[PDB]
C-alpha cells in the first residue's frame, strides 16, 4: 500500500510501505526519498506521534493515510 507524506517543505510525497513495517523502517524509507536522517525525524499521523519500536499497523494507518514529517525545534 502507499501512504502520503507531507515533508519538511510541505511537499506531498508517496511511500510504498506494508503495514507490518516498523516506524524505523519508515524513517529509513523516508531517508531514501527526501534524504533526512531517521533519528532527527518525528512522524505525526492524525494527531498521534508515531514512536520508534511499534508497527505501522499498531496505529491503524492504511492507504491514503498521511504522515507528517517534522524536526525538533527542541528548545
Amino acid at each position: 500500500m502507499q501512504i502520503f507524506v507531507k515533508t519538511l517543505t510541505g511537499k506531498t510525497i508517496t511511500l510504498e510501505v506494508e503495514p507490518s513495517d516498523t516506524i524505523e523502517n519508515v524513517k529509513a524509507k523516508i531517508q531514501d526519498k527526501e534524504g533526512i536522517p531517521p533519528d532527527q525525524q518525528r512522524l505525526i499521523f492524525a494527531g498521534k506521534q508515531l514512536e520508534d519500536g511499534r508497527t505501522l499497523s499498531d496505529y491503524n494507518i492504511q492507504k491514503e493515510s498521511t504522515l507528517h514529517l517534522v524536526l525538533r525545534l527542541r528548545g
Binding site: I36, K48, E64, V70, L73, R74, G75
Partner: protein, 343 residues
Amino acid sequence: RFVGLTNLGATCYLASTIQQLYMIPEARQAVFTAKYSEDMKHKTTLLELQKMFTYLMESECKAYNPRPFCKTYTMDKQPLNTGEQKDMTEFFTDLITKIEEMSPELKNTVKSLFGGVITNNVVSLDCEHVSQTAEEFYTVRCQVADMKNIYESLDEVTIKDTLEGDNMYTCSHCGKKVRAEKRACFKKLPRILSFNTMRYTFNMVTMMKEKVNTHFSFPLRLDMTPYTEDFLMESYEYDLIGVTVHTGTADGGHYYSFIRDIVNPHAYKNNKWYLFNDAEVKPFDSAQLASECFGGEMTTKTYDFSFEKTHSAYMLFYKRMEEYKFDVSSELLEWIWHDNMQF
C-alpha cells in the same frame, strides 16, 4: 499578580505549555471538574495537574515548583527527564493526548476544544475516479521559509498539488498509477486553533538542521474562511490569545510565552498581555508583539550593525469567536489557603 512555574533545569517547554492550557478557561475548568476514576489512565498526572492548576490560580506565591508533576510524568515510555530540552509542540501533543485518554468526558472536551478535521481530496486526470478522505488534527504546521505571513502559509497548506511522476497516485479502483491533483482543506476547525510555524530547514550540504529566522507575521484577528471546505470544494474569525516564542539556534534554546488574559473581562476588553517566562510573569505591551515574535533583522547601535533575530514565534494560539466561575475541589482550596497565610 500571576503565578509562574519554576524551571527544574530544562522545563522551558513545560512551563509554556501548562500556562497556555491554564489560561484557556474551558480547559482550566475541564481539568478542575475532571472526575477521578480507578482504572483511568494517567490518574497521577490528572491529579498532579489539578493541584498545579489550583496553585496557579489561588496561591499568593510567585511560582509553583512543578516537580511533583514532573516526577510522575511519563513521556514515550520512560519517566520525564527534567534536564532534557524538548520541543514545546511535542510536549503539547503529549499532554493533550494523555488528557484525552483519561476519561471519555475529557476526550470529548479535548477533541472539541483542540481537535479539528482536514478533508483532503484526490481527483484523477486520466481517470473517472475520486478519493476524498478525512484527517484528524490538533496542530496545523505552517511553512515559514519563503513565506511572509500565515495567510501565505495557509494558502500553501490548502494548495492544489499535482501528484505526478515519482509521486503518482495508484488509483485503487484501477491498479495503475495516475496523474492526480490533491488538495487539503479544513472541515471542522477547533475552538482553540493552534499553529506550528516550523522555523527550521534541514541543510542538504551540511547535513544539519538550520533554524529559520526570516520575518513572518500573523494577524491579531484571523479570518479562516478561505480554507474551509464550505469555500473550496459557525464562525471562522479567530482572536490571537497566545504566542510561544523560541529564542536561540537549532542546537537548543529557551522558551517563553506571551499569553492574552481572556478571563478578567476588563483585562480582556483592554487587550492586556503578559509575558510568561518560567518563574517570572510580567505585563507585556502588545505594541511590541511584532518585534518580539515576527523575526527579521534588528539593527542596534553597536559601539551600527544589523544581525538576524534568533527569537521568534514557534507556536500560535487562537480562540474562535462567538467573568468565569471555576468550581475547584474545596479540599484543594483549604490546602492553598493554609500555605497562603504565611504570605
